């Protein structure tokens, strides 16, 4: 179907936090795009709020470009550049196993994405594999952060921080602690509180038991995040340096060759 004079709406590929995702084509520029549809009459409209967040975050590395914003028939329409698969899709495609090199290359970029969002006075609140996409073509080495539907100016139970389970207001430390669980999830293939209550299991699982058999940096990362105060500005540089020093000790080259590039 025709959308905003130049876009052609394609098939539904999935969903966001508050709307359906579709594939699409920018007919004028000759480029494939991603289209997010809301519902004009929705009780809690949020698509234009999210567009404002994306607009404010433009210019930042790994922040997707929003091409158009409007309303077509029954829906509010946001048009974004086409990005690649999610880290969740890539993990499943890689048989739910990532090499240490891949986990570290992902960690370096993911910490930077979270830090940029925080530098722009926002917390993400839903740091999970599904919310990170690899770019396509020339941007195939780039980790993009998506979905600002749950974002707030300063989530998923599997990756939620202990503070979140306790019902505490989310802050900068919570986005980073969630990233720590995502990194361990990539190392193990699953988390001990997956497919189980989750709060009880997370609190009864010492960081050292969770990270057993894996480099100490993953535990040090989670311990640092769990030690941060509510209003604390996290030391993002320290956390990246933690994984960067391990990357160098392992003798890996920062060449952006991920496990999926080997298929």
Ligand X SMILES: Cn1cc(-c2ccnc3c2OCCNC3)c(-c2ccc(F)cc2)n1
Per DSSP, what are the bridge partners of residue 33? 24, 81
CB of 253 to ligand X, least distance (A): 28
Chain residue at closest Cβ approach to ligand X? 34
**Cα dihedral 34, 172, 118, 219 in deg (nearest 10):** -80
Q: Of these residues, 26, 74, 108, 126, which one is catalytic?
A: 126
Question: Is residue 132 classed exposed, middle or buried when 0-12, 13-18 and 19+ CB atoms within 10 A define those classes?
Answer: buried
Question: Rounded to the nearest whole angstrom, what is the least distance from the CB of residue 139 to ligand X in the complex?
Answer: 11
Q: Find the shortest distance in angstroms from Cβ 111 to ligand X.
A: 21
**Residues, the chain, total?**
263
Does the annotation place 49 within a ligand binding site? no
Q: Would you say 27 is a known binding-site residue?
A: no
The residues binding ligand X (CB under 6 A) are: 13-14, 16, 21, 34-36, 78, 80, 82-86, 133, 146-147
Was 117 annotated as part of a binding site? no
| Residue 148 is assigned to a ligand binding site | no
CB-wise, 11 or 41, nearer to ligand X? 11
Q: Closer to ligand X at the Cβ: 166 or 263?
A: 263
Q: Please report the beta strands in 74-174, taking only residues with DSSP state E, as ranges in sequence order.
A: 75-81, 122-123, 132-134, 143-145, 152-153
Residue whose tokens read 């003798």: 251
Query: Is residue 89 among the annotated active site residues?
Result: no
Q: Are 153 and 185 in contact (CB under 8 A)?
A: no
Between 77 and 211, CB nearer to ligand X: 77
Task: Provide, rounded to whole angstroms, the least separation between the CB of residue 130 and ligand X.
Answer: 6
| Phi-psi map region of 95: left, alpha, beta (phi>0 left; psi -120 to 50 alpha) | left
Q: Binding site residues, as ranges?
A: 13-21, 36
Q: Binding site residues for ATP, as ranges?
A: 13-21, 36
Residues with a known catalytic role: 126
């Amino acid at each position: 179907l025709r959308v905003g004079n130049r876009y052609r709406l394609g098939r539904k590929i999935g969903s966001g936090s508050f709307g359906d995702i579709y594939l699409g084509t920018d007919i004028a520029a000759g480029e494939e795009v991603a289209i997010k549809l809301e519902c004009v009459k929705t009780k809690h409209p949020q698509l234009h709020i999210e567009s404002k967040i994306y607009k404010m975050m433009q210019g930042g590395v790994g922040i997707p470009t929003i091409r158009w914003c409007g309303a077509e028939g029954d829906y509010n329409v946001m048009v974004m550049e086409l990005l690649g698969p999610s880290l969740e899709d890539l993990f499943n495609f890689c048989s739910r196993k990532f090499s240490l090199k891949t986990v570290l290359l992902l960690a370096d970029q993911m910490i930077s994405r979270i830090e940029y969002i925080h530098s722009k006075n926002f917390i993400h609140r839903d740091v999970k594999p599904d919310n990170f996409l690899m770019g396509l073509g020339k941007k195939g080495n780039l980790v993009y952060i998506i979905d600002f539907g749950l974002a707030k100016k300063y989530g998923t139970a599997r990756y939620a921080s202990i503070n979140t389970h306790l019902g505490i207001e989310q802050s900068r430390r919570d986005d980073l602690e969630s990233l720590g669980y995502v990194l361990m999830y990539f190392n193990l293939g699953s988390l001990p509180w997956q497919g189980l209550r989750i709060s009880e299991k997370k609190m009864s699982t010492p960081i050292e038991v969770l990270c057993k058999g894996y480099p100490s940096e993953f535990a040090t990362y989670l311990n640092f995040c769990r030690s941060l105060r509510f209003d604390d500005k996290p030391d993002y540089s320290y956390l990246r340096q933690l994984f960067r020093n391990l990357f160098h000790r392992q003798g890996f080259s920062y060449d952006y060759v991920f496990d999926w590039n080997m298929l």
